[PDB]
């Protein structure tokens, strides 16, 4: 919240500010003092988000998602085939949401390293839901890989989260 | 205290703070038109981000055309309680009963404007 | 539909058309009667007074002062000046036919005038009901004009003063000032009429209290500028 003030309240302030200073200096010459010139989030509930993408292959993307999750105290997980989930205080999620959508470019091209050498690689992201949950059973943020679409559910299944995946 | 029921866009004390801050910033960035008259123009011209009015207006009717123009043009409008308060946020020593945050090219204020817009759209039910 | 304001707008327009035709008839009647009594027009400046006087006098100017109905129309001072001017007028009696056609158009004109008044009244009454406060500031008539163009009290209220300001300039209240002060006077009246219209759209101060405050507030500034 901010107050402004008018032209005449600038003068009066500027002059009464200046006056005190110069007269105080004046005495100093008379007196001879002066030669003469924490991860954030909310405990009661838990804000959450969920994201869904075609490819995660780029490592630079794989790495950021591990850092920021550990950087901001976001609980959650990530999965894929051969979705992303995040939970915390509402300030945390907003940062992370900004990252996933507006900062990071998932459509961008990268040259990956394989066991033999380096090769080129030439995907989109969109949010599904943000909301509120009785408790977040996620203990830590654990990126993983699943071969099928089923153990992928059983993975979330452990967390009673089967539903968060959308075909 | 009670406000005229007709000051349908009404902001609580929190939204009121944000609004007046953003108005004050818009006054600085020069995306601010102050006065019912100039706010009307920005609506007819199609250059209004959102509209803010004082439920304090003695002639409540003297600004009631704004929500109508707004509804047509699909522009968010909100009320605050105090026209003296709005005045101050507009740089003016005098009370200001309406004002308009106008569109500006590559505004630094864009994100904040977008955010305020959403809040106001929420109050409209 | 059938909003009363559109009725009053159109009634008020008639009034202007009748004013025009009345002006034209006066000019005609003055010209025709010029031969009987050429000096009279200069003596009776008010058109309607002049026409009523002509109808009364007719072909015989002499003894005009003695007439008891003409005493009802003009001031005694004036009656006496015309009477004296009649005795030395250089105009000749009219033919039966020119007298008769003169009388016919005089009757026409007074009938027109009575209807004009009947409508003026109707406009005043209804406007005082449709926009009591607005009316008080600029008069029923101007108020009806600005309402007609705007398309009603609600469409007028949703307008900013600067667009409401034209008719306000040509209003009485504004025109009672010296030309030098009219532009800023029109601006001022517009502003206050904008306030008055808004109150009126919500059917408040239905006795015109606001209209009156506003008027006096407007008149005071008029005095300041003088």
Swiss-Prot record, chain A:
Q: How is it modified after translation?
A: Ubiquitinated. Undergoes 'Lys-63'-linked polyubiquitination by PRPF19 and deubiquitination by USP4. 'Lys-63'-linked ubiquitination increases the affinity for PRPF8 and may regulate the assembly of the U4/U6-U5 tri-snRNP complex.
According to UniProt, the tissues expressing it are described as: Highly expressed in retina, liver, kidney and blood. Detected at lower levels in heart and brain.
Q: Where in the cell does this protein reside?
A: Nucleus; Nucleus speckle
Q: Does the keyword Nucleotide-binding apply?
A: no
GO biological process terms, alphabetically, are: mRNA processing; mRNA splicing, via spliceosome; RNA splicing; RNA splicing, via transesterification reactions; spliceosomal tri-snRNP complex assembly
Keyword terms, alphabetized: Disease variant, Isopeptide bond, mRNA processing, mRNA splicing, Nucleus, Phosphoprotein, Retinitis pigmentosa, Spliceosome, Ubl conjugation
Key word NAD present: no
Q: Name one GO cellular component term.
A: U4/U6 x U5 tri-snRNP complex
The record's GO molecular-function terms, alphabetically, read:
identical protein binding; RNA binding
The disorder on record is: Retinitis pigmentosa 18: A retinal dystrophy belonging to the group of pigmentary retinopathies. Retinitis pigmentosa is characterized by retinal pigment deposits visible on fundus examination and primary loss of rod photoreceptor cells followed by secondary loss of cone photoreceptors. Patients typically have night vision blindness and loss of midperipheral visual field. As their condition progresses, they lose their far peripheral visual field and eventually central vision as well.
> In its UniProt entry, what is this protein called?
U4/U6 small nuclear ribonucleoprotein Prp3
**Source organism per UniProt:** Homo sapiens
Complete-protein stretch covered: 436 to 672 of 683
From Swiss-Prot, chain B:
Q: Which GO terms describe its cellular component?
A: box C/D methylation guide snoRNP complex; dense fibrillar component; nucleolus; nucleoplasm; nucleus; precatalytic spliceosome; protein-containing complex; small-subunit processome
What family, per the record?
A: Belongs to the eukaryotic ribosomal protein eL8 family.
Domain of life, per the record?
Answer: Eukaryota
Q: Where is this region: Interaction with U4 snRNA and U4atac snRNA?
A: 33-45
Tell me the residues on which Phosphoserine occurs.
Answer: 119
List-wise, which residues carry N6-acetyllysine?
18
Chain spans, region Important for U4 snRNA-binding: 93-125
Q: Where in the cell is it found?
A: Nucleus; Nucleus, Nucleolus
Give the function comment from the record.
Part of the small subunit (SSU) processome, first precursor of the small eukaryotic ribosomal subunit. During the assembly of the SSU processome in the nucleolus, many ribosome biogenesis factors, an RNA chaperone and ribosomal proteins associate with the nascent pre-rRNA and work in concert to generate RNA folding, modifications, rearrangements and cleavage as well as targeted degradation of pre-ribosomal RNA by the RNA exosome. Involved in pre-mRNA splicing as component of the spliceosome. Binds to the 5'-stem-loop of U4 snRNA and thereby contributes to spliceosome assembly.
Quaternary structure annotation from Swiss-Prot or TrEMBL: Identified in the spliceosome B complex. Component of the U4/U6-U5 tri-snRNP complex composed of the U4, U6 and U5 snRNAs and at least PRPF3, PRPF4, PRPF6, PRPF8, PRPF31, SNRNP200, TXNL4A, WDR57, SNRNP40, DDX23, CD2BP2, PPIH, NHP2L1, EFTUD2, SART1 and USP39. Interacts with RAD17 and PRPF31. The complex formed by SNU13 and PRPF31 binds U4 snRNA. The complex formed by SNU13 and PRPF31 also binds U4atac snRNA, a characteristic component of specific, less abundant spliceosomal complexes.
What is known about the tissue distribution of this protein? Ubiquitous.
InterPro entries per UniProt: eL8/uL1-like, H/ACA_rnp_Nhp2-like, Ribosomal_eL30-like_sf, Ribosomal_eL8-like_CS, Ribosomal_eL8/eL30/eS12/Gad45, Ribosomal_eL8/Nhp2
Q: Which organism is it from?
A: Homo sapiens (Human)
Kindly indicate whether the keyword Acetylation belongs to this entry: yes
One Pfam family hit: Ribosomal_L7Ae
Q: Which residues form a coiled coil?
A: none
**Protein keywords:** Acetylation, mRNA processing, mRNA splicing, Nucleus, Phosphoprotein, Ribonucleoprotein, RNA-binding, Spliceosome
Question: Per the annotation, which location comes first and is thus the protein's main one?
Answer: nucleus
- Keyword RNA-binding among record annotations: yes
Curated annotation (Swiss-Prot), chain C:
Annotated coiled-coil segments of the chain: 1-35, 96-130
Q: In which tissues is it expressed?
A: Ubiquitously expressed.
Interaction with U4atac snRNA, annotated site positions: 183
Localization annotation: Nucleus; Nucleus speckle; Nucleus, Cajal body
Task: Write out the similarity annotation.
Answer: Belongs to the PRP31 family.
Q: How does it assemble?
A: Identified in the spliceosome B complex. Component of the U4/U6-U5 tri-snRNP complex composed of the U4, U6 and U5 snRNAs and at least PRPF3, PRPF4, PRPF6, PRPF8, PRPF31, SNRNP200, TXNL4A, SNRNP40, DDX23, CD2BP2, PPIH, SNU13, EFTUD2, SART1 and USP39. Interacts with a complex formed by SNU13 and U4 snRNA, but not with SNU13 or U4 snRNA alone. The complex formed by SNU13 and PRPF31 also binds U4atac snRNA, a characteristic component of specific, less abundant spliceosomal complexes. Interacts with PRPF6/U5 snRNP-associated 102 kDa protein.
Q: Name the chain's protein.
A: U4/U6 small nuclear ribonucleoprotein Prp31
Biological source species: Homo sapiens
Which part of the entire protein is covered? 86 to 332 of 499
